[PDB]
Amino acid sequence: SGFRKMAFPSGKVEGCMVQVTCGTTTLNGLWLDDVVYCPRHVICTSEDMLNPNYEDLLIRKSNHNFLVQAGNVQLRVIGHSMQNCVLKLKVDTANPKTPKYKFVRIQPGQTFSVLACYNGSPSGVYQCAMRPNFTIKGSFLNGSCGSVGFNIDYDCVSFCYMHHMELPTGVHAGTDLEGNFYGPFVDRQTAQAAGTDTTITVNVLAWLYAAVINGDRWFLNRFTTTLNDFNLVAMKYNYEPLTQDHVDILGPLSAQTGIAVLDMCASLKELLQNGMNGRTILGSALLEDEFTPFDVVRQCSGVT
């Protein structure tokens, strides 16, 4: 028992981290097979960042301007290209530590682990969720760009995120591994406000099921509700509307605990309406929404 914000083991990803330098800018790169993936803003100077013309900036760059270092050894760059907001640097050596991998674009509400890196070196690993407004509430400092988000299915690493920037609001924006930003964000140092950060309702319910499994049951009540009644409450509290797809995904947790999804929605409704009254659930004094139903099942079953 016990329930923690758990990240995937980061070993497979640590073996892919490299340092990429272009001019006076150094950030992180992801070396998979014979390609190094990194944010295209590596070609920018501090002046360029305000309104960069990436196509024009890249014309002035040759393969030899991209310095790629894997630990203490320099990789030879034999090609470069821009795909959306990422650069793909073709190197002459396949990464011997390349794990089995996929590139996936995640949905808002999905969680992933981040291996924060500086100068191609890992500093820490933490669990994240892609917010409904497509930002991530990470922990990143200048130099962390190019750090990646991922999930792992046994031996396959699914890369879903590459860190690009911090919004003036202190939240983070980035792309999938094809270089497409999550949300409306652009790789430019300009005012980019995030939309309403709604709560991921299906995740809060999944976390309430994890609480019941682990012994924290005080919030269980004598009530039930309907999807429509629940959603009136979810709208008032800036929670995502719950759909029948969400109920279906919560099915295994509902079956394991014997608590119908709509009964758990009624417990959630009372918690939204009344608050926690100074009580805690799984050591938290607020409703946690960065555990998906899959995360709860994985953690509560011990999947390796």
Q: Does 225 contact ligand L7V by CB under 6 A?
A: no
- Contacting residue, 70, 113, 117, 166, with ligand L7V by CB under 6 A: 166
- Contacting residue, 88, 164, 246, 269, with ligand L7V by CB under 6 A: 164
DSSP conformation class of 193? -
Binding residues vs a copy of itself (CB under 8 A): 1-11, 14-15, 115-119, 121-126, 137-141, 143-144, 166, 170-172, 214-215, 275-276, 278, 280, 283-286, 298-304
Task: Decide if 141 contacts 118 (C-beta within 8 A).
Answer: yes
Q: Residue 63 or 139: which CB sits closer to a copy of itself?
A: 139
Sequence-separated (6 or more) residues with CB below 8 Å from residue 172: 135, 136, 137, 138, 140, 163, 165, 166
Concerning whether 145 is annotated as a catalytic residue, the answer is yes
Binding at 272: pick from a copy of itself, ligand L7V, none (beta carbon under 5-8 Å per type): none
Scanning 4-12, 134-142, 148-156, 231-239 for contacts with ligand L7V by CB under 6 A, the matching segment is: 134-142
d(Cα 164, Cα 186) in Å, to the nearest integer? 10
Q: Residue 65 or 119: which CB sits closer to a copy of itself?
A: 119
Binding at 242: pick from ligand L7V, a copy of itself, none (beta carbon under 5-8 Å per type): none
DSSP conformation class of 226? -
Q: What is the DSSP string of 9-30?
A: P-HHHHTTEEEEEETTEEEEEE
- The active-site residue, picked from 16, 22, 38, 41, is 41
Sequence-separated (6 or more) residues with CB below 8 Å from residue 8: 113, 125, 150, 151, 152
Taking Cα atoms as reference points, which of 163, 221, 212 lies closest to residue 38? 163
Concerning whether 85 is annotated as a catalytic residue, the answer is no
CA distances for 49 relative to 53, 182, 204, angstroms: 9, 19, 38
Least separation, in Å, of the C-beta of 57 and a copy of itself? 26
CA distances for 131 relative to 112, 170, 282, angstroms: 11, 14, 22
- Contacting residue, 12, 41, 80, 131, with ligand L7V by CB under 6 A: 41
- Contacting residue, 6, 49, 233, 300, with ligand L7V by CB under 6 A: 49
Task: Decide if 35 contacts 89 (C-beta within 8 A).
Answer: yes
Q: Does 189 contact ligand L7V by CB under 6 A?
A: yes
Scanning 58-66, 94-102, 164-172, 226-234 for contacts with ligand L7V by CB under 6 A, the matching segment is: 164-172
Q: Does 42 contact ligand L7V by CB under 6 A?
A: no
Q: Does 179 contact ligand L7V by CB under 6 A?
A: no
Query: CA gyration radius for the chain?
Result: 21
Least separation, in Å, of the C-beta of 180 and a copy of itself? 22
Q: Residue 125 or 227: which CB sits closer to a copy of itself?
A: 125
Annotated catalytic residues are 41, 145
